[PDB]
From a paper:
The radio-resistant bacterium D. radiodurans encodes a PARG homolog, DrPARG, whose expression is upregulated after radiation damage, so it might play an important role in DNA repair. Our study demonstrates that DrPARG is involved in catalyzing the breakdown of endogenous PAR and DNA repair in D. radiodurans. From observing the structural peculiarities of DrPARG, we show that although previously thought to be an obligate exo-glycohydrolase, bacterial PARG could exert both exo- and endo-glycohydrolase functions.
In fact, the missing residues located in the intrinsically disordered N-terminal region of DrPARG and might be highly flexible. The structural flexibility may reflect the multiple space groups observed in X-ray crystallography because packing patterns are constantly influenced by the flexible regions during crystallization.
Numbering used by the authors: 29 to 103, 107 to 279
The structure:
């Protein structure tokens, strides 16, 4: 039997095309300065921070560290795979209205990818990190967007190297712009493409904080950076702790 909430979420899945970029900027403009934004940095999984926040959250959204080319990246240790094995996210990402995001990214033939985003609303979370069922499913909105593949740019098209950071900065701006357009109050962010995509975890942490300090200042109630780091040296998490300290 089909799981509860899957059909409503798949039916409501929506694509933001790159020609909507100024619609998303204006939504950020219009929402600037609405609250006192509290921003933590934690050790939890994206979905752990989600299930924590949901009882305080009018409008909960979390960022999927997405593959540009096939839904779920084709599945092993990555965040998007965490989200799919424990939620109905995959049923949304394979929806018909989302096909253009995967189709155009493939035709792009560029490691920086395009500026399409997938908004999946009310995605049921069914399991915790240990993998056990949940009493009741807890729903979360998911913005899906690929960070530029810094690793593939360096190994395949170094000419685009100077474009990695601008690309990541404008794309992060559209992610917050989607969240503002959908009037979301609580954002679960993280180490967007600092694992398999090889981006510099210091760079994405400061790019986030720059926008949270400028264009997106006050735009959301509560931002949670849920950076999972199992490596003993803890360099990813330590980069977001270090870089987000002034803003909290
Ligand atoms: N379950 C998790 N929950 C929260 N944070 C996590 C989790 N797993 C890892 N992190 C942290 O988030 C950081 C980045 O996790 P990554 O998934 O590599 O995102 P990307 O930007 O590199 O590219 C994702 C690609 O890899 C996949 O194949 C996708 O399909 C894409 O093709 C990790 O280093 C962790 O510190």
């Amino acid at each position: 039997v089909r799981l509860p909430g899957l059909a409503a979420m798949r039916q409501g899945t929506r694509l933001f095309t790159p020609e909507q970029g100024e619609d998303l900027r204006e939504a950020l403009r219009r929402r600037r300065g609405s609250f006192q934004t509290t921003c933590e940095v934690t050790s939890e999984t994206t979905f752990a921070a989600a299930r924590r926040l949901r009882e305080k959250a009018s409008a909960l959204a979390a960022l999927n560290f997405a593959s540009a080319k096939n839904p779920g990246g084709g599945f092993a240790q990555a965040q998007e795979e965490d989200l799919c094995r424990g939620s109905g996210l995959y049923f949304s990402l394979t929806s018909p209205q989302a096909e253009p995001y995967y189709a155009v990214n493939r035709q792009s033939h560029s490691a920086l990818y395009t500026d399409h985003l997938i908004y999946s609303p009310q995605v049921p979370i069914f399991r915790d990190d240990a993998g056990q069922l949940l009493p009741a499913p807890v729903p979360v909105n998911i913005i899906t967007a690929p960070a530029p593949n810094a690793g593939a740019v360096a190994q395949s098209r170094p000419e685009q190297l100077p474009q990695v950071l601008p690309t990541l900065r404008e794309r992060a701006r559209r992610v917050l712009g989607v969240a503002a357009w959908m009037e979301q109050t609580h954002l679960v962010l993280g180490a967007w493409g600092c694992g398999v995509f090889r981006n510099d975890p210091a760079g994405v942490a400061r790019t986030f904080r720059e926008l949270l300090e400028g264009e997106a200042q006050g735009a959301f109630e509560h931002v949670t950076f849920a950076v999972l780091d199992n490596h003993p040296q803890h360099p990813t998490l330590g980069a977001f702790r270090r870089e987000l300290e002034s803003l909290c």
